[PDB]
Design an enzyme around this catalytic site. Sequence first.
Site, PDB file in Angstrom:
ATOM      1  N   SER A 180     -68.427  11.783  32.527  1.00  0.00           N
ATOM      2  CA  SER A 180     -67.722  10.631  32.844  1.00  0.00           C
ATOM      3  C   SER A 180     -67.737   9.619  32.430  1.00  0.00           C
ATOM      4  O   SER A 180     -68.962   8.697  32.318  1.00  0.00           O
ATOM      5  CB  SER A 180     -67.821  10.318  35.214  1.00  0.00           C
ATOM      6  OG  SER A 180     -69.037   9.740  34.677  1.00  0.00           O
ATOM      7  N   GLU A 211     -81.538   8.717  37.057  1.00  0.00           N
ATOM      8  CA  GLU A 211     -81.761   8.167  38.156  1.00  0.00           C
ATOM      9  C   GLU A 211     -81.494   9.435  39.101  1.00  0.00           C
ATOM     10  O   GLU A 211     -80.621   9.963  39.376  1.00  0.00           O
ATOM     11  CB  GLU A 211     -79.963   7.253  38.978  1.00  0.00           C
ATOM     12  CG  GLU A 211     -81.224   6.360  39.631  1.00  0.00           C
ATOM     13  CD  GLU A 211     -80.789   6.972  41.184  1.00  0.00           C
ATOM     14  OE1 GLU A 211     -80.070   7.728  41.263  1.00  0.00           O
ATOM     15  OE2 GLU A 211     -81.668   6.856  41.957  1.00  0.00           O
ATOM     16  N   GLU A 259     -60.942  30.849  19.266  1.00  0.00           N
ATOM     17  CA  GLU A 259     -59.792  31.334  19.870  1.00  0.00           C
ATOM     18  C   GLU A 259     -58.728  30.248  20.364  1.00  0.00           C
ATOM     19  O   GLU A 259     -57.795  29.937  19.741  1.00  0.00           O
ATOM     20  CB  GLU A 259     -59.115  32.048  20.523  1.00  0.00           C
ATOM     21  CG  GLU A 259     -59.760  33.921  20.061  1.00  0.00           C
ATOM     22  CD  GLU A 259     -59.664  33.954  18.560  1.00  0.00           C
ATOM     23  OE1 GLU A 259     -58.758  33.930  18.106  1.00  0.00           O
ATOM     24  OE2 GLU A 259     -61.391  34.326  18.432  1.00  0.00           O
ATOM     25  N   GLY A 271     -72.057   4.204  32.358  1.00  0.00           N
ATOM     26  CA  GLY A 271     -72.964   3.450  30.906  1.00  0.00           C
ATOM     27  C   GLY A 271     -73.924   5.209  30.364  1.00  0.00           C
ATOM     28  O   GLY A 271     -73.308   5.034  29.732  1.00  0.00           O
ATOM     29  N   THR A 272     -74.474   5.029  31.385  1.00  0.00           N
ATOM     30  CA  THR A 272     -75.210   6.446  31.060  1.00  0.00           C
ATOM     31  C   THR A 272     -74.379   7.012  30.705  1.00  0.00           C
ATOM     32  O   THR A 272     -74.878   8.414  29.868  1.00  0.00           O
ATOM     33  CB  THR A 272     -76.589   6.539  32.471  1.00  0.00           C
ATOM     34  OG1 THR A 272     -77.512   7.754  32.171  1.00  0.00           O
ATOM     35  CG2 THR A 272     -75.159   6.717  33.818  1.00  0.00           C
TER      36      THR A 272
HETATM   37  N1  LIG Z   1     -64.330  14.254  39.451  1.00  0.00           N
HETATM   38  C1  LIG Z   1     -65.121  12.866  39.776  1.00  0.00           C
HETATM   39  N2  LIG Z   1     -65.465  11.904  39.007  1.00  0.00           N
HETATM   40  C2  LIG Z   1     -66.788  11.298  40.330  1.00  0.00           C
HETATM   41  C3  LIG Z   1     -66.847  11.799  41.490  1.00  0.00           C
HETATM   42  N3  LIG Z   1     -67.775  10.425  41.532  1.00  0.00           N
HETATM   43  C4  LIG Z   1     -68.195   9.833  40.471  1.00  0.00           C
HETATM   44  N4  LIG Z   1     -67.271   9.821  40.003  1.00  0.00           N
HETATM   45  C5  LIG Z   1     -67.138   9.389  37.922  1.00  0.00           C
HETATM   46  O1  LIG Z   1     -68.149   8.372  37.614  1.00  0.00           O
HETATM   47  C6  LIG Z   1     -67.355   6.724  37.196  1.00  0.00           C
HETATM   48  C7  LIG Z   1     -68.845   5.926  37.284  1.00  0.00           C
HETATM   49  O2  LIG Z   1     -70.093   6.411  37.066  1.00  0.00           O
HETATM   50  P1  LIG Z   1     -71.212   7.538  38.009  1.00  0.00           P
HETATM   51  O3  LIG Z   1     -70.809   7.285  38.796  1.00  0.00           O
HETATM   52  O4  LIG Z   1     -72.369   5.746  37.930  1.00  0.00           O
HETATM   53  O5  LIG Z   1     -71.626   7.637  36.810  1.00  0.00           O
HETATM   54  P2  LIG Z   1     -72.992   6.963  35.380  1.00  0.00           P
HETATM   55  O6  LIG Z   1     -71.332   6.884  34.715  1.00  0.00           O
HETATM   56  O7  LIG Z   1     -73.653   8.283  34.578  1.00  0.00           O
HETATM   57  O8  LIG Z   1     -73.020   5.979  35.994  1.00  0.00           O
HETATM   58  P3  LIG Z   1     -74.827   5.969  36.751  1.00  0.00           P
HETATM   59  O9  LIG Z   1     -74.055   6.243  38.377  1.00  0.00           O
HETATM   60  O10 LIG Z   1     -75.624   4.851  36.106  1.00  0.00           O
HETATM   61  O11 LIG Z   1     -75.332   7.056  36.628  1.00  0.00           O
HETATM   62  C8  LIG Z   1     -66.612   7.254  38.259  1.00  0.00           C
HETATM   63  O12 LIG Z   1     -65.405   6.302  37.114  1.00  0.00           O
HETATM   64  C9  LIG Z   1     -65.720   8.152  38.724  1.00  0.00           C
HETATM   65  O13 LIG Z   1     -64.918   8.511  38.072  1.00  0.00           O
HETATM   66  C10 LIG Z   1     -66.626  12.999  41.851  1.00  0.00           C
HETATM   67  O14 LIG Z   1     -66.737  13.125  42.619  1.00  0.00           O
HETATM   68  N5  LIG Z   1     -65.656  13.330  41.412  1.00  0.00           N
HETATM   69 MG   LIG Z   2     -76.529   6.308  38.071  1.00  0.00          MG
END
Ligand SMILES: Nc1nc2c(ncn2[C@@H]2O[C@H](COP(=O)(O)OP(=O)(O)OP(=O)(O)O)[C@@H](O)[C@H]2O)c(=O)[nH]1
Ligand SMILES: [Mg+2]
Lengths: 188, 102, 430, 61, 439
Positions: free
Chosen positions: E140, E71, E254, E144-145
């Site tokens: 993360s 996206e 290491e 999904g993606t």
């Molecule tokens: N540490 C941290 N984690 C984040 C942050 N923003 C989102 N997340 C993590 O991202 C997870 C949700 O997934 P998305 O943010 O939607 O990213 P994605 O998994 O690739 O899904 P898409 O939005 O479709 O791309 C949440 O459970 C958060 O743990 C952030 O600013 N810092």
């Molecule tokens: Mg997305």
Amino acid sequence: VEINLFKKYYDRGDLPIAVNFHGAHRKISWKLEPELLDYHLYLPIFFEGLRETEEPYKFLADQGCEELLARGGAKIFAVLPQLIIPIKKALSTKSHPIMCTTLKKIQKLVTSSDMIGEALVPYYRQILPVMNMFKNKRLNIGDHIDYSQRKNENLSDLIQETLEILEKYGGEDAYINIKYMIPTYESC
Amino acid sequence: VENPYENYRIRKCTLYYYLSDGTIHVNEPKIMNSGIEQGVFIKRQQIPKQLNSTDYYTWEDLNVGININLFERVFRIVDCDSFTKEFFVYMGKKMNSPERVP
Amino acid sequence: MREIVHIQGGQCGNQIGAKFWEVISDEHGIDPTGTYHGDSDLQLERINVYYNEATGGRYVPRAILMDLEPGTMDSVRAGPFGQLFRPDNFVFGQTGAGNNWAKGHYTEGAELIDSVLDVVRKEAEGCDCLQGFQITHSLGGGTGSGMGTLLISKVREEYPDRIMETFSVVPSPKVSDTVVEPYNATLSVHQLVENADECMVIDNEALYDICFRTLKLTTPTYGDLNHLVSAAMSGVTCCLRFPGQLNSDLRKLAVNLIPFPRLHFFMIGFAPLTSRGSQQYRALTVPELTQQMFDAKNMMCAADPRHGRYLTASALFRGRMSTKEVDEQMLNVQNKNSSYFVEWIPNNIKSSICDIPPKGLKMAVTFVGNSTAIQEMFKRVAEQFTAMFRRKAFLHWYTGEGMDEMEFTEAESNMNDLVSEYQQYQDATA
Amino acid sequence: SKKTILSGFMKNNSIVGFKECLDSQLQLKDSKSEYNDKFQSKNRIHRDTSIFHIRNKSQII
Amino acid sequence: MREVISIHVGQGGIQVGNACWELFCLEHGIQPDGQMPSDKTIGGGDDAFNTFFSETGAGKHVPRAVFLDLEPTVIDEVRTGTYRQLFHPEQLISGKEDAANNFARGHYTIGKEIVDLCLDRIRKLADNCTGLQGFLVFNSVGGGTGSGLGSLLLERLSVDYGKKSKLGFTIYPSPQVSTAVVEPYNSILSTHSLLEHTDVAVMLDNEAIYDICRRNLDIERPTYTNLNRLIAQVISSLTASLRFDGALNVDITEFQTNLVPYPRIHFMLSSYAPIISAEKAYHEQLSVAEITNSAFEPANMMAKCDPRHGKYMACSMMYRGDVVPKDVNASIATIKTKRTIQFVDWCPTGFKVGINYQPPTVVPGGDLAKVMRAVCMISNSTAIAEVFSRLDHKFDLMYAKRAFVHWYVGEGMEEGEFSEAREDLAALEKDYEEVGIET
Ligand SMILES: Nc1nc2c(ncn2[C@@H]2O[C@H](COP(=O)(O)OP(=O)(O)OP(=O)(O)O)[C@@H](O)[C@H]2O)c(=O)[nH]1
Ligand SMILES: [Mg+2]
Ligand SMILES: Nc1nc2c(ncn2[C@@H]2O[C@H](COP(=O)(O)OP(=O)(O)O)[C@@H](O)[C@H]2O)c(=O)[nH]1
């Protein structure tokens, strides 16, 4: 309806059946031979009787509905559209004893004659829903053996075999539709 | 832009003002053989001085030769009907000299 | 990329759009003439989602206005912002549906609906990457009920893999506007569930309750109620047009709120909504916004939220605000009402954050919660429907247009099926 | 001339409680979104080491 | 001649990936445009920028990363901001349709149309390098993606390159504070991917990092911005051993040889300290002895698991600053004395110690203040079974009634796919208890 359609129809004097039982337990001897009868006007009326819970209308409806599809021959297919809305009410009575009575009747229907299940697939959205109500509610006793297998009272056991019959004769498309109503089902 | 024959158009449109409830209405009559879906232009209502405001017109604001603001589109009210002149003279606000529409 | 078209119908539906575009146009700074006059550089980063481009620089909403009577169709243009529409998109008949569903679904609409799909196909094929379509139709009116419903059934048939959205207003019992309201409602749901990907209900009753209590404005007008539905329109697609911490496209909201295929009915709300005077005083903060979000009165549907139990919920906060205060608050509302949240779906609240605040407020929140309470709405509609049908009253009209009395019985059974099985998941436990 | 001017074309087509929210709450810059305040600030190889701690009770907000 | 190629997949990865470069960009003397300032050469020696960069003959430099996402809004933002000039314009691959948290979408349905391009860009960077040691992947799992594209890359890389080591800093969901509503599902499936394709992966669950901000930084409104920066130092803490001098050096290859007892157990939870603001960081001596205790204080674990509930297998914990080796010897010995932190019965000595000199730098406009001494700990503990267990149970409740199953089975993944994932976590759960028993 204020009164079950079965009871009113019988009291008039147009049903062709009577008890006249002299034997081991009971039996029904039809006033006229089965083949002549018309299924369009009678076949759905009997299925209305399954709902009845006050004797003698309970059994006297039951015994025939098993009997009609046994000797039907090939005319049964004509009545398939007419059997949907009645039976839908039958499963909605929420009464434990009834579902045992009607479920066997419906299961035996598919095997009665060939090329009928393929016609029954499109109507799955009507008969499938209540079937999901009690899928998981089953007896959990354990090691102690069950004494009650003789007569089929186990709701979970009766239904589970029911779908198996439906899909085997349902056809290729049968599997996909069954899942879309009840999710937990596993393909066979 | 795309016109081969033309580069700027003119729509002949008249403005009505009701004295009963401070309402203004704009309708552009049918111009024959013009090939444009013509009908009601501005449904009869009260329109503000600037978009999304709380100040409303008073009939003492309209006049011939001055620019009225209406949904950021600029109108040039040009000609006066016969009945218009008397009311202005009766109430007592000056009236301006007319000119033909280019 | 991932842009959406809009097609609206019916006087109720058509009027809804006549205010939605005005509201949506303001946010990006698109003035009525269509020439750019914006302020913030971010105003035009993602205009392709809702707007095409035209030579000369004037923009045109991707709207296909449809109605079966020309009286209103010639009205929407004449209003403010009423000339952003390409008149080529317009389509309409010459007779009028006359609140007769069969007329708007079998006889008349079938005649005119061939052209309507043509303009829709052209608009859909013109986009870069298609995402879904959104409808605004009222179930209380025939043409919207019949012609509006029939369009979805076909449209889904050409684009089986794209998302869809429908805004519907069902008739509440305390106020009635159409004597034939019960009939068109039962048939409508018979077809909206089977094809619509997402649909949400907004009731006239709720608008009148929400308007007379919080805003307390003494003289509501059809312009007023249409405003609330306007903000909700923009409350579901904000992340599609501006950068955000947690983007959640229309599809993303779809996955996280429909546990099973047959339940796709949602009820929405908006906040903050402050009285005309009391706005200078309230303290706008996450704790304050959150409490007014879940209140029973704010919700847009007649159903009492507590009469059922929340199967799932959604939240899309607007503007700049720390996530921690957002994250912490959602959990807090998930234990102070521990009984009302179904217990077999742990972590049953979803949160999204967007960084561009709607014009007119420093912060905002849009609520979309799938509350099992909706069983009240369909149940009563069934009660009114049954009474008028056993005496065969008002049915001779429909039977004269090739329809048979059997079809109505089938539809009634289906609605009771959805209501009966909708409560199934209300009582089941772990 | 207080309430007698009522007219149907004025009552119905004039929104009442849904006009622009009064000022003092519009104070927000639509162009400024997060990830722009700090990451895109500019950065500098040398930072301004100056720090200060005003001798007044810090406002609580 | 030592270099590593960084990989970012998923919006969370990029956003955290965005933060990870300002920290690395500043610490080497490259301006936002990448042109080394005519004067003010903050960097002594040479070859430092070579560790993560590549010279273009004269002027600017190119980060060694490829940002992958489906996206474009998050990716599109970076190409507009102040760091436009840095990243190579033909490596920031972007898609068109969001995965919508559908794991099957990013693994079976849509991911196949972008995995090919990303690998191609990977080969180009690999060829330029000379002594490639390994990769780093951020993602993360709460999406999904993120899981889908993330899972495919690790599966794809392990067969294309081979024995080359890989590392992954995943981010799992919090025990109770959750953002998405399908987070439990993608956790069990995702852990399947990196349970048989990765060498080491760290846990940085969101909830704990929230706590670390409140108790020390003295901030009551943290945002996702501050969270990324804290994770930035740990990236700096571990990787700083390769590009600078050291009295006792530690390499990336290491760590994988001293922290993972068996082929299965390679999940470790890390922590950092000190994390002290400016208004309070200068009123205490910050002696080395006191910093290490804070490392093992149970409230500063960055993973929401209490180590006291389990056993310790090995901790590979680094140092930085003006730390002298004599001080550490007492600290490690002194820590062993405590009676509430007990070790397994089969690892009499289980500490790996590293020392580096260049202090951590204080980015402007952030939260962390300036210090001399800091220690970054990456320790594997027997208690990690809790997080796997708790996420496992959440899987059962929703899955007992096949809720939400219909949004995946329609994306090409066979229905039996879900069940197999459970065995691994069920198999994994019994594993921790297996080694835990005293001989
Ligand atoms: N540490 C941290 N984690 C984040 C942050 N923003 C989102 N997340 C993590 O991202 C997870 C949700 O997934 P998305 O943010 O939607 O990213 P994605 O998994 O690739 O899904 P898409 O939005 O479709 O791309 C949440 O459970 C958060 O743990 C952030 O600013 N810092
Ligand atoms: Mg997305
Ligand atoms: N909220 C709102 N609802 C309206 C408005 N105008 C009409 N409606 C609704 O529209 C319904 C009647 O719609 P109808 O004219 O039959 O739709 P049509 O058949 O498509 O022309 C009524 O029940 C109203 O509730 C309006 O201005 N605001």
